[PDB]
Design a protein around this nucleic acid. Structure first.
Lengths: 83, 149, 185, 83, 129
RNA sequence: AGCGUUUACUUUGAAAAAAUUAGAGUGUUCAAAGCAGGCCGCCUGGAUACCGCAGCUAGGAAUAAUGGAAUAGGACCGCGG
């Protein structure tokens, strides 16, 4: 194809493309409010953590770091947050 | 591509367009600076501090929340290490390789990888000398390299 | 009044009227706790495209964030007082001339034209932060800066787009169009 | 193509491809001259007028003759803009 | 490494124009590329273009008209004196009718015919015909 | 009259032996040359351009280097000395 709008690409094209090769680069990661059932409180965790985030005063382990995204513990309500 | 390898890896961080701070974040400029001080005091490098902050507290950049960069904050208060924390890690690596090579004298691969690491030390050391964050006397030599932590 | 004009000169009857209106608003309304040490630098009034007018206010750059905190809550009762007009706060950036060969320290890169003009546009659209910029270079030779604004505050500030276009054309002399994208947030 | 006086001097003027905007050579044998019929609005019947297109040899064997004819027709409003 | 940015930008336009593409995204945007493309537009070889700000080196999307045979660069930037602009425009350009040598002078970035008129020599950037 | 981060770049000006080459005039009978000649005592001529690089001079400020506050011996403003 000759005629393609490189200025107005539909958002499925940009979500497909590598994060650096979009028309303006943006992170694939996000922040999410994760709370364990026992406690009352919501602690901010990064998607691709790479540290073992703990609930206050060493209550329990909250997320496990892996190659890509972090494994959140089984029995934890996570709400990814937007700005 | 990579300096001392044939690889052509495209895999780094991609900052968002918006330099603004998010609404949800209730930590202020001085609150983050106070925690940066405490983490560095415990005994931690600018790389680890930034990781621990944005994993646990939710601080995309210190530069966007505060005005300044992490090392710039540390070396104002006076918590910054003497030689930089990338030249430190290269020297410590060269010590560990050279110690392994002392016992394993038949390791010709370890010999070759020591030449690449020490070449990269020399290369980065002189950059810092021109910028004047090392005294021009400064000389990495293997005999008195193990004493530099 | 509460207007500290930079040069030791006269805050004219127009600028005085707004500084007195801010003193009265303080003494009457709840947010007098904040308006203790906040001040105005100046206040012009431009004619925006159509049959509309936009009163403009200038702020000391230090206390801008202090204004920003209460900026939307304050602008409401400014527009309810000055009925058929729009109002928006802008910080007064100092702007140093490019040091020529002919002829005092290194000019900081916040005291430069491109950085000051970027900061002017940042403050024009306060409640709605900028998410994109496209500088369409037209065939005659002229430019057209096309700003993409955050889709939150669309409904709140979509009626102020021609005010912002007119104010920026006045302060800088550059033609701007504010669009609202549907494809990111 | 005229001299100092203003006399058009070259012995003919070649056509230009509607898609690529190249000049169609005197012996570009894979170049087409395609008339798409113009239809009366109220009846949906042939008027006796047409919306003619020319395309170059390179474009056709590239395989962009299809999309280029389509986009020219959709620009003229022969094909619906919705499509 | 990427030594010359204008060199990359003009090769990108040239490749896209041959292939018959209708617009092309030249990446590392710079004052020299934009000022080059304005000159190229004012004579009417390209269309209107739109420069895309990420908080870095920008991008440019150039709308292409199929009336551009070649847009090249000369590296290094040789110091063209005014009298030698003949022997340059002799051996670079197709004929004495059309084609332009754009060169960066005291005044600004402008083509050989303008620089000849203004009575200024300067450093050569490239050529377009 | 005195000034003004430096240099490279480009434009102008100054100073640059003649002969040679390019070149204006001139029927050596034509020409190569020559610097002579022409008008019924007089009227003319013996021009001009080029002479890289380096040094000198005055305009331009794109492009390419270089510099300026970050243990503040920072600039300015005035007092105490």
């Amino acid at each position: 194809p000759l005629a393609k709008d490189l200025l107005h690409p539909s958002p499925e094209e940009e979500k497909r493309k590598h994060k650096k090769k979009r028309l303006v680069q943006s992170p694939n990661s996000y922040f999410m409010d994760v709370k364990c059932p026992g406690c009352y409180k919501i602690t901010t965790v990064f998607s691709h953590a790479q540290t073992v985030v703990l609930c206050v005063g060493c209550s329990t382990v909250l997320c496990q770091p892996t190659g890509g995204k972090a494994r959140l513990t089984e029995g934890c309500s996570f709400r990814r947050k937007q700005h | 591509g990579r300096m001392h390898a044939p690889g052509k890896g495209l895999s780094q961080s991609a900052l968002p367009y918006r330099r603004s701070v998010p609404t949800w974040l209730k930590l202020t400029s001085d609150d983050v600076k106070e925690q940066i001080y405490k983490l560095a005091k415990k005994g931690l490098t600018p790389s680890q501090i930034g990781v621990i902050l944005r994993d646990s507290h939710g601080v995309a950049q210190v530069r966007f929340v505060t005005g300044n960069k992490i090392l710039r904050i540390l070396k104002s208060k006076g918590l910054a290490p003497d030689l930089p924390e990338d030249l430190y890690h290269l020297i410590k690596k060269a010590v560990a390789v050279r110690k392994h090579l002392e016992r394993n004298r038949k390791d010709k691969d370890a010999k070759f990888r020591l030449i690449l690491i020490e070449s990269r030390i020399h290369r980065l050391a002189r950059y810092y000398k021109t910028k004047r964050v090392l005294p021009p006397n400064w000389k990495y030599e293997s005999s008195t390299a193990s004493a530099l932590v | 009044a509460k207007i500290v004009k930079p040069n030791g000169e006269k805050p004219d009857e127009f600028e005085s009227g707004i500084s007195q209106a801010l003193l009265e608003l303080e003494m009457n309304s709840d947010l007098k706790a904040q308006l203790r040490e906040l001040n105005i630098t100046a206040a012009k009034e431009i004619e925006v495209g159509g049959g509309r007018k936009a009163i403009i206010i200038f702020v000391p750059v230090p206390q801008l964030k202090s204004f920003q905190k209460i900026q939307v809550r304050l602008v409401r009762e400014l527009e309810k007082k000055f009925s058929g007009k729009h109002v928006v706060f802008i910080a007064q950036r100092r702007i140093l001339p490019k040091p020529t060969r002919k002829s005092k320290q290194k000019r900081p890169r916040s005291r430069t034209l491109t950085a000051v003009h970027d900061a002017i546009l940042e403050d024009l659209v306060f409640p709605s932060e900028i998410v994109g910029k496209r500088i369409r270079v037209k065939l005659d030779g002229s430019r057209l800066i096309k700003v993409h604004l955050d889709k939150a505050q669309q409904n709140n500030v979509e009626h102020k787009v021609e005010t912002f276009s007119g104010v920026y054309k006045k302060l800088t002399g550059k033609d701007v169009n504010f669009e609202f994208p549907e494809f990111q947030l | 193509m005229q001299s100092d006086a203003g006399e058009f001097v070259d012995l003919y003027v070649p056509r230009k491809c509607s898609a690529s905007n190249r000049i169609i050579g005197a012996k570009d044998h894979a170049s087409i001259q395609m008339n798409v019929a113009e239809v009366d609005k109220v009846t949906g019947r042939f008027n006796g007028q047409f919306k003619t297109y020319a395309i170059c040899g390179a474009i056709r064997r590239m395989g962009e003759s299809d999309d280029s004819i389509l986009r020219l027709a959709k620009s003229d409003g022969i094909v619906s803009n919705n499509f | 490494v990427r030594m010359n940015v204008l060199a990359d930008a003009l090769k990108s336009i040239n490749n896209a124009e041959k292939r018959g593409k209708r617009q092309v995204l030249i990446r590392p945007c710079s004052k020299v590329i934009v000022r080059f493309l304005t000159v190229m537009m004012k004579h009417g070889y390209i269309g209107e273009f739109e420069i895309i700000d990420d908080h870095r080196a920008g991008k440019i999307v150039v709308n292409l008209t199929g009336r551009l045979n070649k847009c090249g660069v000369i590296s290094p930037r040789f110091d063209v004196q005014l009298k030698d602009l003949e022997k340059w425009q002799n051996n670079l350009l197709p004929s004495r009718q059309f084609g332009f040598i754009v060169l960066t002078t005291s005044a600004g970035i402008m083509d050989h015919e303008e620089a000849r008129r203004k009575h200024t020599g300067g450093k050569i950037l490239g050529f377009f015909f």
